[PDB]
């Protein structure tokens, strides 16, 4: 399907509770709470190059679909995980008890991460 492009967050639910349970330090939660971050994807085959920019904070991640790689979380911690291609438009992965589902529909990306009873929801559109 090719997911290349630049997108910006339009809306989100449960950012604070989810981020809290992730151990993201208070002040950052307060700061990123109101930042409409930009995400850039470069998709080439099973190679996904991902860059997330939140104001002055940037995180670079790169992984191969199906392969176990090391993902950098927003705290700085690094984890190992396999990102899978579920269906034709969904990228699914699991780490630290979190279940992550990214669904692509043209200009719209919908991301859903569930931790316990919390469901952090993000809706982005291509810019
Ligand atoms: C697509 C998977 C979901 C990615 C969620 C990313 C969430 C990032 C969380 C917030 C980071 C907080 C950074 C606060 C601002 C730091 C620098 C600044 O002030 O500009
Ligand atoms: C807890 C947040 C830590 C974020 C680390 C990155 C994890 C990303 C894992 C899944 C890859 C799916 C890529 C989807 C990009 C969506 C961009 C967006 O929603 O802004």
Protein described:
- This protein is mainly β.
- The protein has one domain (1-127): Beta Barrel (Lipocalin).
- It has two helices and eleven strands.
- The protein has helices spanning 15-22, 26-32; strands spanning 5-13, 38-44, 47-54, 57-64, 68-72, 78-82, 84-86, 90-95, 98-105, 108-115, 118-126.
- The strands form two sheets. It has a nine-stranded antiparallel sheet.
- Strand 10 and strand 11 (118-126) form a beta hairpin.
- The radius of gyration is 14 Å and the shape is globular.
- The structure holds oleic acid (OLA) (2 copies).
- One oleic acid binds next to strand 1, strand 8, strand 9, strand 10 and strand 11.
- The modification Phosphothreonine is found at residue 51.
- Belongs to the calycin superfamily. Fatty-acid binding protein (FABP) family.
- The modification Phosphoserine is found at residues 11, 39, 56, 100.
Quick overview:
The protein has 127 residues and is mainly beta.
Question: What topology emerges from the helices and strands here?
Answer:
Blueprint: E1 5-13, H1 15-22, H2 26-32, E2 38-44, E3 47-54, E4 57-64, E5 68-72, E6 78-82, E7 84-86, E8 90-95, E9 98-105, E10 108-115, E11 118-126
Antiparallel strand pairs: 1-2, 1-11, 2-3, 3-4, 5-6, 7-8, 8-9, 9-10, 10-11
The chain binds oleic acid (2 copies).
């Amino acid at each position: 399907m090719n997911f290349s492009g630049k997108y910006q967050v339009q809306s989100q639910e449960n950012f604070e509770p989810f981020m809290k349970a992730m151990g993201l330090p208070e002040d950052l939660i307060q700061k990123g709470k109101d930042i409409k971050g930009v995400s850039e994807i470069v998709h080439e085959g099973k190679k996904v190059k991902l860059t997330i920019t939140y104001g002055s904070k940037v995180i670079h991640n790169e992984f191969t679909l199906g392969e176990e790689c090391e993902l950098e979380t927003m705290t700085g911690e690094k984890v190992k995980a396999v990102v899978k291609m579920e269906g034709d438009n969904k990228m699914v992965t699991t780490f630290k008890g979190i279940k992550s589902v990214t669904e692509f529909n043209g200009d719209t990306i919908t991301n859903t991460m569930t931790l316990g009873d919390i469901v952090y929801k993000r809706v982005s559109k291509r810019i």
